[PDB]
Structures are given as structure tokens and as C-alpha cells.
Design an enzyme around this catalytic site. Structure first.
Site, PDB file in Angstrom:
ATOM      1  N   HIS A  41       0.796  -1.225   0.000  1.00 39.33           N
ATOM      2  CA  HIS A  41       0.000   0.000   0.000  1.00 39.33           C
ATOM      3  C   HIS A  41       0.837   1.288   0.000  1.00 39.33           C
ATOM      4  CE1 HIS A  41       0.092  -0.316   4.613  1.00 39.33           C
ATOM      5  NE2 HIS A  41       0.123   1.002   4.512  1.00 39.33           N
ATOM      6  N   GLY A 140       2.102   5.928   9.964  1.00 41.26           N
ATOM      7  CA  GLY A 140       3.512   6.005   9.659  1.00 41.26           C
ATOM      8  C   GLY A 140       4.355   4.797  10.056  1.00 41.26           C
ATOM      9  N   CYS A 142       3.719   1.508   9.359  1.00 40.82           N
ATOM     10  CA  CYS A 142       3.728   0.338   8.484  1.00 40.82           C
ATOM     11  C   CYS A 142       5.132   0.065   7.940  1.00 40.82           C
ATOM     12  CB  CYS A 142       2.739   0.532   7.335  1.00 40.82           C
ATOM     13  SG  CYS A 142       1.107   0.190   8.028  1.00 40.82           S
TER      14      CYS A 142
HETATM   15  C1  LIG Z   1       0.400   1.771   8.154  1.00 36.09           C
HETATM   16  O1  LIG Z   1       1.301   2.682   8.682  1.00 36.09           O
HETATM   17  C2  LIG Z   1      -0.916   1.839   8.929  1.00 36.09           C
HETATM   18  C3  LIG Z   1      -0.765   1.237  10.331  1.00 36.09           C
HETATM   19  C4  LIG Z   1      -2.061   1.363  11.183  1.00 36.09           C
HETATM   20  C5  LIG Z   1      -2.410   3.012  11.516  1.00 36.09           C
HETATM   21  C6  LIG Z   1      -3.082   3.023  12.606  1.00 36.09           C
HETATM   22  N1  LIG Z   1      -2.601   1.746  13.427  1.00 36.09           N
HETATM   23  C7  LIG Z   1      -1.949   0.762  12.334  1.00 36.09           C
HETATM   24  O2  LIG Z   1      -1.492  -0.292  12.560  1.00 36.09           O
HETATM   25  N2  LIG Z   1      -1.822   1.049   8.149  1.00 36.09           N
HETATM   26  C8  LIG Z   1      -3.043   1.610   7.638  1.00 36.09           C
HETATM   27  O3  LIG Z   1      -3.354   2.732   7.850  1.00 36.09           O
HETATM   28  C9  LIG Z   1      -3.918   0.689   6.808  1.00 36.09           C
HETATM   29  C10 LIG Z   1      -3.677   0.976   5.335  1.00 36.09           C
HETATM   30  C11 LIG Z   1      -4.627   0.105   4.533  1.00 36.09           C
HETATM   31  C12 LIG Z   1      -4.476   0.400   3.045  1.00 36.09           C
HETATM   32  C13 LIG Z   1      -4.332  -1.362   4.811  1.00 36.09           C
HETATM   33  N3  LIG Z   1      -5.293   0.955   7.117  1.00 36.09           N
HETATM   34  C14 LIG Z   1      -5.780   0.719   8.456  1.00 36.09           C
HETATM   35  O4  LIG Z   1      -5.155   0.078   9.222  1.00 36.09           O
HETATM   36  O5  LIG Z   1      -7.006   1.276   8.804  1.00 36.09           O
HETATM   37  C15 LIG Z   1      -7.649   0.680   9.879  1.00 36.09           C
HETATM   38  C16 LIG Z   1      -8.624  -0.343   9.317  1.00 36.09           C
HETATM   39  C17 LIG Z   1      -8.101  -1.531   8.526  1.00 36.09           C
HETATM   40  C18 LIG Z   1      -9.071  -2.556   7.960  1.00 36.09           C
HETATM   41  C19 LIG Z   1     -10.567  -2.389   8.184  1.00 36.09           C
HETATM   42  C20 LIG Z   1     -11.094  -1.200   8.975  1.00 36.09           C
HETATM   43  C21 LIG Z   1     -10.122  -0.174   9.542  1.00 36.09           C
END
Ligand SMILES: *[C@H](O)[C@H](C[C@@H]1CCNC1=O)NC(=O)[C@H](CC(C)C)NC(=O)OCc1ccccc1
Ligand SMILES: *[C@H](O)[C@H](C[C@@H]1CCNC1=O)NC(=O)[C@H](CC(C)C)NC(=O)OCc1ccccc1
Lengths: 298, 299
Positions: A41, A140, A142
Site C-alpha cells: 500500500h 507512519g 507500516c
Molecule cells: C500503516 O502505517 C498503517 C498502520 C495502522 C495506523 C493506525 N494503526 C496501524 O497499525 N496502516 C493503515 O493505515 C492501513 C492501510 C490500509 C491500506 C491497509 N489501514 C488501516 O489500518 O485502517 C484501519 C482499518 C483496517 C481494515 C478495516 C477497517 C479499519
């Protein structure tokens, strides 16, 4: 004595952590030999075959990579499961001896939590029954990796991708295979439950006895519960079926407490207690693997 | 989101950890510049003024030091409080920018738990009111250091010496000053009990609210003055301000006085629901450790 969550030392991992920025997406990668791995992503938020099209259409010069302020130029890109693999024009001269391995359910490993390509903090996690972690990750972070350190070198086991509702963290191995039945998409996902890991709880209760915390077996007449009986109880009460571990041979011998006494304790203590703490806690702790306890008791 | 015990990255410390062996005594040291610091009981089990004489009577060649299996020859020796300072034949070219600083009560710091001069694992500790830690140490781990990583570089705050009753741990700063009312002698030592740290509990309750766990504040607020009076009779420290609380209170909309009332309600434990997985108040997180784990939380 004492029992703590033990993290593996991070020097070999730190020499590999880089930032990767594409557009408004900022995350971290892992630089080994002449390539960087990071969550796909970095490309944006896609589904299914859209990832391959986003890969084809991207430009290597749009990926900005730094290692401690030094630019790494991207000279090739490819998808590896849920990861992007970016070949770069410079070999990491500090590449450690390493392997990619899969964590097993119940295992611990260490997270090198990173922001802007710099490791900020380390902590222990446990792979849960449904392939998730209970970690500590913000925007940030990931591309932060999970790892172990052995006599042989580093084992990279995990790279972080997402947070499910309830603060349930998900990611992949370094071959880009997700650890449980979730994907890197911001849609609701139904995932199997995470029952408490009975094996790990037995290890923690032995840790408690090692540390002179044994009120839950030394007081009251002895109780034992057979594995068979414990498994049938566990299947109705949100605990995993018991699994043996060679550590228990050591622990039972050194403490004089049997595994079957520990299973009966789990059943007695499964709704919590208030009589006295066990290693500081009033509920059973399934987060310690048998290996983590052995390293602190013998 | 999520809350974990966060250890500082160890690369800089690892490049300073050595073994020191004298006779049958095996422990660890810290190699900076052209010297190694290690606990003075590398010399044996002495008391009071005997340490000075034991150091004077030792030979430099009886101290064996290894860095990653490479020999460091001792060429000088000196007693520095509870430590020996052993001058060595080679300067550590990976000495980081460092300072020796005293941890303060309630602070976290990271332990590089070493055996045979090799860091085996790291974890966080909290300096308790009586100058002890709840760590995890076995024979051979003396000389393991506690540290923080800051803008300026590494702060070395602790060196490990001994285990006290109750699986609690004691040691010195890197000037050889013990952190509490104990010494490096294998006799029973009475030390005052350690009340729960109210400041850190406030930080942990804020951490819970950042993580959408706020049932315990959902009025009757409690003033700092009333809290301090209650705490002094119930085994909690007086409240202490920390500038992280300006950030937490603004982000969460929950005041310190709400949190102090919650500590009093929750002081004997609860079973309504977990707070960050727990059914008892947790004082092991400093406000800095919570801030580092919440500063990017939007919700
Ligand atoms: C990457 O840095 C980030 C890590 C998350 C931020 C908050 N706590 C984490 O572990 N990943 C994302 O933001 C991720 C990106 C997507 C394109 C996979 N999205 C996410 O984690 O949103 C929360 C969520 C995921 C799946 C279903 C409903 C909400
Ligand atoms: C130095 O490595 C060692 C660390 C102790 C070993 C057991 N757990 C620790 O933290 N320090 C000592 O052994 C210390 C030596 C004195 C001369 C200061 N003595 C000590 O800690 O006595 C208590 C003890 C409890 C359990 C096993 C061994 C010693």
C-alpha cells in the site's frame, strides 16, 4: 528472578530500516542486499488485480527512500505478495546474516517499531490464534518488522500493514503472506476469534511458581485436571486445546508442580481472582511463550 | 493505537557491552572511550572499607575482558563508588555521544540484560519509590546497564548489582552511587516499601482513554489537594505534574482531577471491564512512554 517481556537486541535490524515515501504515503522498509521490502500500500489503497496495475503504472523515481539521510535510488520494482520489492542501486553493506521465517501461533517475537525510517521503540508480541497481534502502531509505522535473533543470525518473521477494529494488528511474513484471514483494505472484515493460549498460560503459571508465587497450587488440597478433560472444558470456554512443550519437562521437574495441576488451576482461575496477584496480575496471561519463560528461569 | 512496554533501540549500547571475569566471578561491563565500568564485586564479596584494599591488592592481569570475543587488556584500575573503572588497551571507536544521568522516581529506562558480555534480551523497568526495580536478572547478569536514548545521544542511568527479597532488583548509577538504601552485600537488608506511583497511573489512564477505554471516567472530580491527602494514607504517592498531561488532557477532554477521582474509585481493583487488559491500576508506564505511543492518535 523476575519475569519480563524480553525483546531481542535490535542492532542488526536498525542497520536495515529505511523510510519509503510515495506521494502522501509515508512508511518504512527493510533494506537487505540490493533491495528494499515494504507494504504494497505504499502504492495507494487498491484491491485484487488493481495492485498489479498500480505496480505497472508507478515510476521508480516516485519512490523516495532514505537510510539515515542517504538517498537510495530505486532501479526496479516488483510485487511479492502483499509487499513491494524495490531494487536499489546500492547494496546494504551492513546486511546481517538472516533468514525469512514464519512465526508459529503462540510464539513471541520482537517488533522494531519505526517512524520515518528510524526505529523508535522495541516491544514483544505474541502471534494470536487468528494470526493477529496486540501491538502498538500509529500512522507512519507500516513496514516495521518483527524479528528474532538466534546464534545463526536474524530471523525476519513479520512486517506490519494494518489495524483491525479493537486494536488488532495485522501484517505479513517477509514473503508477503498475510498471517490470518485479513487483507490490506479498509473495509470491514470478519476474522476468526483469538482464544487464550492455554500452553502459554501453563508456561506463565510455572514462571509464577519459579518466582515464589504459588498460592494457587500450594494452598487448598491438590487438584489435577486431565488433558482430555481440560481440552473439553477449554473448547467451551474460549481457551485453546492444550499443547505440550519440552520446557514443561524442565519446569515440572524444578518446581514439583505437574502440568495437570496447572490445567486445573487454569480452569479455577479462568474468570479471574482477587485473592492475591500472580506475577502482578489478576487474570491469566497467555502472552509468554514457553521459550520466553525458560530464558528467564533456567 | 495499542499500548506496550517500549524499549529503546539497543544498537549503541550493544557496541559497548563487554564481559569481565575475575577468578570464578563472571559479569558484564560497559566499554566507553578507553575504560570499562563494572560492579566492584567482580573482586569478591567484601564489605565497606574492604573494597579499596581489595582493589589495591588486585593485579590488572587477573581481569579478563572480551568485546564480542576480542580481548581487551586491562592496563589500569580504580574504584568509583560501587563500580570498578578498568582502563583498557583499546579505545572504543563506537563510543556513542553519552551522558551519565540519574534516573528519577517514576522514570522508565531500558535494560540491556547481558550474560557473558552478550545482550540476551531487553526490557523496560520503572524506578520505584525506594530505588529498586522490578526486573529480570539471573546469575551472570551483573553489570547489565539501564539506558535511555535521547536527542543528545545515550543516557546511561543504571548498572545492575543485586537481587533483593521479593524478586526486586538494586544497582547503581554510572558514578557508582546506589539507587536506594541498600549495598552490595549478601545479608538481609530492610528496605522501605514502595507506594504505587500516582503520576504514572494518571498517564496510563490517559493511555486507556486514547485507546477508547474510558468507562472509568463515565460527576465527582477530585482536587490535587484532596487526592494527596487520600493517597498518603492508602499507599499511593502524591500527585506530581508532568508536562505530558497538558497534551493528554487537551486531546482527550479528561482533566487530571477526573483521573485522580478515578484512581480513588479503582484503588482496590475492579471487575466491571478491563482497562488496557488489566483489572488493577498500572503504575509502570511513565508519561513519556505513553506520549510516545499516543502522539499520532487522531480519534
Ligand atoms: C500503516 O502505517 C498503517 C498502520 C495502522 C495506523 C493506525 N494503526 C496501524 O497499525 N496502516 C493503515 O493505515 C492501513 C492501510 C490500509 C491500506 C491497509 N489501514 C488501516 O489500518 O485502517 C484501519 C482499518 C483496517 C481494515 C478495516 C477497517 C479499519
Ligand atoms: C550479579 O550477576 C548478581 C545478580 C543477581 C543474581 C541473581 N539475580 C540478580 O540480580 N548479583 C549477586 O549475585 C549479588 C552479589 C553480591 C556480592 C552483591 N548477590 C545477590 O544478589 O544475592 C541475592 C541472590 C538471589 C538469588 C540468586 C543469587 C543471589
Amino acid at each position: 528472578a523476575g519475569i519480563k517481556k524480553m525483546v531481542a537486541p535490535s542492532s542488526a535490524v536498525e542497520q536495515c530500516v529505511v523510510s519509503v515515501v510515495h506521494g502522501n504515503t509515508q512508511l518504512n522498509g527493510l533494506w537487505l542486499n540490493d533491495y528494499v521490502l515494504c507494504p504494497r500500500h505504499i502504492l495507494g489503497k487498491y484491491t485484487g488485480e488493481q495492485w498489479r496495475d498500480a505496480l505497472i503504472n508507478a515510476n521508480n523515481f516516485d519512490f523516495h527512500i532514505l537510510y539515515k539521510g542517504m538517498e537510495l535510488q530505486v532501479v526496479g520494482r516488483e510485487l511479492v505478495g502483499a509487499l513491494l520489492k524495490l531494487k536499489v542501486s546500492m547494496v546494504n553493506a551492513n546486511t546481517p546474516k538472516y533468514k525469512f521465517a514464519k512465526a508459529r501461533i503462540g510464539d513471541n517475537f520482537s517488533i522494531a517499531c519505526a517512524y520515518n525510517g528510524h526505529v523508535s521503540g522495541l516491544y514483544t508480541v505474541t502471534l494470536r490464534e487468528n494470526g493477529t497481534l496486540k501491538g502498538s502502531f500509529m500512522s507512519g509505522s507500516c513496514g516495521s518488522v518483527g524479528y528474532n535473533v538466534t546464534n545463526e543470525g536474524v530471523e525476519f518473521v513479520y512486517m506490519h500493514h494494518l489495524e483491525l477494529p479493537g486494536c488488532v494488528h495485522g501484517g505479513s511474513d517477509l514473503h508477503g503472506i498475510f498471517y490470518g484471514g485479513y487483507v490490506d483494505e479498509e473495509v470491514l472484515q470478519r476474522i476468526p476469534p483469538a482464544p487464550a493460549n492455554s500452553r502459554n498460560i501453563v508456561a506463565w503459571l510455572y514462571a509464577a511458581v519459579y518466582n515464589n508465587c504459588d498460592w494457587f497450587v500450594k494452598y487448598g488440597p491438590k487438584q489435577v485436571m486431565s488433558v482430555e478433560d481440560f481440552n473439553e472444558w477449554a473448547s467451551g470456554y474460549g481457551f485453546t486445546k492444550f499443547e505440550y512443550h519440552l520446557a514443561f519437562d524442565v519446569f515440572s521437574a524444578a518446581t514439583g508442580v505437574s502440568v495437570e495441576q496447572m490445567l486445573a488451576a487454569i480452569k479455577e482461575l479462568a474468570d479471574g481472582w482477587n485473592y492475591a496477584p500472580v506475577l502482578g496480575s489478576f487474570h491469566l496471561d497467555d502472552e509468554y511463550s514457553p521459550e520466553m519463560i525458560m530464558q528467564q528461569t533456567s
